[PDB]
């Protein structure tokens, strides 16, 4: 829903964790302002020079423990956005949620990846929230809130990563 637009923006590991993994009131998600990096990522049959940046972060259900009383454990899923340069010709259908963008004869592949973080929080069932699903996150973050044609929306990639050795691997 349009609840996605209401989500605030966070910057830095502890700010993202601090906002989401709140025991008193756990939060569904937040947008992430992050650094763009450049390096090889394997998709399909080979490696592609890929631009990567965090874009969103959301709470994920770990477990529900028994008692005296009913407790709920949450984890943070960090969502990254990628531009796998030249990958769009052979991997246009590799992901359920993806976009293609032409740069001359070259076809870039725009997709999202999720990384589960280690930090967890124990919340009582009375304070528990309904977590967002990976399908909804991809639809709102990439499909509805990012335009590869103009590199704009709720986020944009910093292409200067290609020229920064600190942001290259």
């Amino acid at each position: 829903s349009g609840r996605f637009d209401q989500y605030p923006t966070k910057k830095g590991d502890f700010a993202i964790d601090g906002y989401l993994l709140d025991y008193s009131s756990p939060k569904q998600g937040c947008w992430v302002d992050g650094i763009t990096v450049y390096g090889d990522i394997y998709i399909g049959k080979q490696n592609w020079g890929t631009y990567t940046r965090p874009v969103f972060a959301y709470l994920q259900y770990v477990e529900t423990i028994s008692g005296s009383g009913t407790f709920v454990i949450y984890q943070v899923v960090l969502v990254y956005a990628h531009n796998a340069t030249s990958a769009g010709r052979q991997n246009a259908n590799a992901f359920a949620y993806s976009k293609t963008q032409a740069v001359g004869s070259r076809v870039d592949l725009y997709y999202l990846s999720a990384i589960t973080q280690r930090k967890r929080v124990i919340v009582p069932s009375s304070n528990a929230v309904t977590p967002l699903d990976w399908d909804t996150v991809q639809r709102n973050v990439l499909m509805e809130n990012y335009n590869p044609g103009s590199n704009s929306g709720h986020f944009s990639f910093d292409w200067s990563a290609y020229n920064d050795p600190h942001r290259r691997y």
Binding site: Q46, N47, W48, G49, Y51, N83, A84, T85, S86, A87, R89, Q90, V103, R106, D108, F157, W159, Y162, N163
Partner: peptide, 9 residues
């Protein structure tokens, strides 16, 4: 415009 070093096949 995004720069690339990617080599197909």
């Amino acid at each position: 415009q995004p720069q690339s070093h990617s080599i197909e096949l």
